[PDB]
Ligand binder design. Sequence first.
Ligand SMILES: Cc1cc2nc3c(=O)[nH]c(=O)nc-3n(C[C@H](O)[C@H](O)[C@H](O)COP(=O)(O)OP(=O)(O)OC[C@H]3O[C@@H](n4cnc5c(N)ncnc54)[C@H](O)[C@@H]3O)c2cc1C
Ligand SMILES: Cc1cc2nc3c(=O)[nH]c(=O)nc-3n(C[C@H](O)[C@H](O)[C@H](O)COP(=O)(O)OP(=O)(O)OC[C@H]3O[C@@H](n4cnc5c(N)ncnc54)[C@H](O)[C@@H]3O)c2cc1C
Ligand SMILES: [Mg+2]
Ligand SMILES: [Mg+2]
Ligand SMILES: [Mg+2]
Lengths: 588, 588
Amino acid sequence: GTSQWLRKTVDSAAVILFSKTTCPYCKKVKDVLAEAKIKHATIELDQLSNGSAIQKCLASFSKIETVPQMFVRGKFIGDSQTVLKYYSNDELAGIVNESKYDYDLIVIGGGSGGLAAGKEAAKYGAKTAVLDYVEPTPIGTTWGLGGTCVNVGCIPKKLMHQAGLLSHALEDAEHFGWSLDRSKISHNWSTMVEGVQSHIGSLNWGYKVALRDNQVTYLNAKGRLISPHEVQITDKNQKVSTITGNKIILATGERPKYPEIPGAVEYGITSDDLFSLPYFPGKTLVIGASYVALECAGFLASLGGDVTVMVRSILLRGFDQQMAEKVGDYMENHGVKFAKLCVPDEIKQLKVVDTENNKPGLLLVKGHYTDGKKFEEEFETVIFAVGREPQLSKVLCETVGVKLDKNGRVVCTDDEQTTVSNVYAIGDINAGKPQLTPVAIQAGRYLARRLFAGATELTDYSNVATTVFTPLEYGACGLSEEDAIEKYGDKDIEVYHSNFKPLEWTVAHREDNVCYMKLVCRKSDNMRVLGLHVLGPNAGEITQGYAVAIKMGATKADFDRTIGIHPTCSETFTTLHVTKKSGVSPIV
Amino acid sequence: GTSQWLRKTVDSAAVILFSKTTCPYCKKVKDVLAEAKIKHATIELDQLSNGSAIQKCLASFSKIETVPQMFVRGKFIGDSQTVLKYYSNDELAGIVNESKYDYDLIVIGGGSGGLAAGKEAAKYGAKTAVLDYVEPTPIGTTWGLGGTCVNVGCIPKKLMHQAGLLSHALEDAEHFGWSLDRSKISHNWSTMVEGVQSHIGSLNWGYKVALRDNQVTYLNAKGRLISPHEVQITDKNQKVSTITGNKIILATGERPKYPEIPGAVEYGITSDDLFSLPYFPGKTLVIGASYVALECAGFLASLGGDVTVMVRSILLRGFDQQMAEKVGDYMENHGVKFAKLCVPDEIKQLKVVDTENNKPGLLLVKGHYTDGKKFEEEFETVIFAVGREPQLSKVLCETVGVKLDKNGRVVCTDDEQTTVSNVYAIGDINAGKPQLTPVAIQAGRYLARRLFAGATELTDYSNVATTVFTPLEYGACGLSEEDAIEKYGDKDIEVYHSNFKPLEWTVAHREDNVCYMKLVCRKSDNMRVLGLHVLGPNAGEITQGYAVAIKMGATKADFDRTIGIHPTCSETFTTLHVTKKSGVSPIV
Ligand SMILES: Cc1cc2nc3c(=O)[nH]c(=O)nc-3n(C[C@H](O)[C@H](O)[C@H](O)COP(=O)(O)OP(=O)(O)OC[C@H]3O[C@@H](n4cnc5c(N)ncnc54)[C@H](O)[C@@H]3O)c2cc1C
Ligand SMILES: Cc1cc2nc3c(=O)[nH]c(=O)nc-3n(C[C@H](O)[C@H](O)[C@H](O)COP(=O)(O)OP(=O)(O)OC[C@H]3O[C@@H](n4cnc5c(N)ncnc54)[C@H](O)[C@@H]3O)c2cc1C
Ligand SMILES: [Mg+2]
Ligand SMILES: [Mg+2]
Ligand SMILES: [Mg+2]
């Protein structure tokens, strides 16, 4: 184990120092490298249980067993006296910069995962390039550095969700004694978009500054992997060139799909366009039933819009379907209309978008229900939220040998390695992984540490918590009830559940028994918590801390012995007692 | 210890059935008791690991080793045929109601702990009385059933905190595109109090209905324990009588203290009066620096009031002082004035409260600072928040033998037992325990199960999470940093910390580096999390789930391997990396 780890670490690290924290010769070398502005990884052998074995194995590369030992790109450079010699003779800079490739790491994609990986690799002295290019949407929308979450995902969507939540805060404020009249207050879409876009612009700029400050080369260029170590880049002026890299990280993400029906690309939009749209969508049809579809429909309705969601089959496929039904029922009680069991056939244009008066156009949507009955209605905006897809055919030449699955995602080992030994993939394009921003970030950071700092820690993709930011939010960690029953059998599953009412909803005269939580547990394993589910305000804040406990193997007894914080919504997890098997009502 | 447990269980239970889930004879006995409206505890021997030894040890009472076996107040009643004989002969009701005392349980105090204990005991057939009486405040304020939290504590305070938080929501709404103008909106104190009090009234009524539905006798009477089994009650018409009970639970709580200075009782108020006050306090001085003092000052300022807090020494004594300073600094930047290192000497009346026109009076407060300088300022309302005290000299006759500590609280074992063996104490009067509503509720419920259902589970009072509902909320679980350093030494403590900015604060132009969190960890115990601290919105929702993980022994590695939910405040705990020892800034 140790010899294999050391060989892999030495071969892959850009600049690495084997050290001991007590040794003054090691401190002197560290001080020289810091003065020279040479970044590097450091392995403190006295801080590792197998450090003595590592010292012995180092002689297989350097012929010495002492510390310090400096390596650059697989080559032993020297001990203390030698490194000081190179520094004194002004030779060290050239040595640490010598490389077979232009870069130690090329990251293709400057989104959540790619920026995290590139910044982390640079900390260990890896010469790093991050490529990011945003192909415009069909109507021409484009945006800056940072990827989907920053520009057209989690960040703007949650800010618009907050704008929507504030509608109810205005209503509640009256009951709490404030003098406003909610019925005389209106919402200005353009003012909200300006504020959202100003924040996004600060993030775009902050990422460019962060790459500069980490000595990462940022290329606003489209990359294509043409062989294991060669990336062809096309710049803003269509100039084509090739750069080379030792390790390659594919982090190119996904883009929205469109249905293959007349008028969809021409006259509809997707989430990519929504978050910078200069005019309020107006009367809107959302086609689809993913979390993207429902989150966007929810905030548009809360802002005062006339919104309909066209659902082919079910809501939130892949999520617990009891929770999905409760999410949709709340939305329907709060203004969202649903066209159920329905698909679109064609979008016809009745009015062109009025860019001068800043108004949407008008569309005729024709569709049909599963029984064959026709759907026909006019909408000012049609938003397609019918899934997202990787677009690797343009990122990857087929001759490179990177295996893709049937959906076009990259088939990766548990350490993100593709079928090409120096090429890795992270984020939404890594087949089978949860498609979430903090997952991409952890994967990229942890991978960079394994490549360039000798780390061994893998990303754990199990029991990753989620939150759907619908008008009433839905947080979850672990299995749905139906997946738990499928895996273990109904007789081995116990479900504890309860309704609850936020204290803030009492004086506000809101609903008594809409918020809901459950714990899905395995009886034969000490009532292990297999899944946690909560519908209520601030559901992501509620869920997050429990994800640590679930990671640690929490049981129902662990929830019971923990004392609640009062008054909170979250504390209702600490006193659950009604089982579904008992048939006793969960109402409070 | 099976023999000792069975002896204690049979001796204490009111009505108890020993059964097996796999027995249709037990099913018949359960059905008969259910039809007879006879509530009882049930111990399913097949579900316990030592069930076989219990069956054998039951014969020491019943001379049989089969199930079912029924017991009443220490006496074996019979098997299947025998219980049916009594039922057929109309003898069973008399048998199950025979008792040496009027009640199996008398609970003195109808607050958080006492109501929880009384309701739980009644589930197992314990004939239960709950006594509750609310001695009026000096100005005459009184309230209904439910105790401090329901009437004059957590419930109204959090509702008034929410009214205060809505001030900032109104401001934020403008930046999110809503057309209101916060500067022309005002707050109506009386409207908010009316709504708060209507909710409280629904809780008072709900508790009365809950006791009725559980067959608990509710006496709105002042109780005094005059001997181990005798409680003297004084009813609303001053009629004095004595009732007897087998077990006694003392759950009488505490009341606000006043400083011993002229004018304090006559002209000041406390939290007991604030939550139903019919007029806005106006310009207000809060004397004290507890969480009660700061929570009330905070919401009064957010409602638009002119508020000053007079602090003898420090804020939030007993809490992490770095966090306390950050809490206070936020309040000072958001309208709360602080008179630091200052104590009051006298409250002088300048105008009497005008009850007819619903206006406060006017007071002159004289005090002095530690540097000798004088304090002299006028206020419309003076609120004392200088601690709370038990008042057991009127609850307990000294001859009973219940030992109190130097502060007047009850000295209890880890199972809530006093020095008188049938008398227990729960909630705020139990010396040394966290004085919180969910603690009182757990203690009461768990104690009732041990007394009347043979349970053995104790309440765990360690690492009980808290939240201070100041304008920026402060959640904590475990040790303060200073307590951890005192216990383990600075060299064995590592502190990970970060500022954060809620995404909701970006478009709203709120502060960049005021929200803050830290994990206080023990290096030599695998970086065990000793204390978690968070200052930010929704801090109780953030903190609660982590309390389960801390109960389970979470380490820093457990936080690191858990993935964040994005975008949330809570996810910041999953990526902490800056140590205090490193000196690196925690700013974003
Ligand atoms: C509407 C919406 C809401 C979401 N909400 C949440 C949420 O609340 N929480 C959450 O955790 N996740 C959320 N997500 C998911 C999250 O956005 C993604 O999981 C995350 O952005 C994936 O990161 P990534 O690094 O894999 O890819 P991306 O962030 O998509 O980055 C890939 C980047 O590479 C660029 N690129 C593509 N091809 C090339 C090429 N050939 N050369 C150069 N650059 C290229 C892309 O244009 C893009 O900039 C949401 C997504 C959407 C669409
Ligand atoms: C302003 C304030 C805010 C608080 N906020 C929170 C918070 O956010 N979260 C939290 O967890 N805790 C909070 N607390 C603490 C919480 O209120 C107490 O911990 C809890 O109420 C204690 O319950 P208890 O059963 O011990 O006593 P109590 O709830 O005080 O009940 C005791 C009852 O017994 C009655 N009684 C007294 N003597 C007699 C007698 N001789 N005969 C009959 N009846 C009698 C009393 O009048 C009262 O009704 C707060 C407290 C205050 C004062
Ligand atoms: Mg702005
Ligand atoms: Mg599942
Ligand atoms: Mg009302």
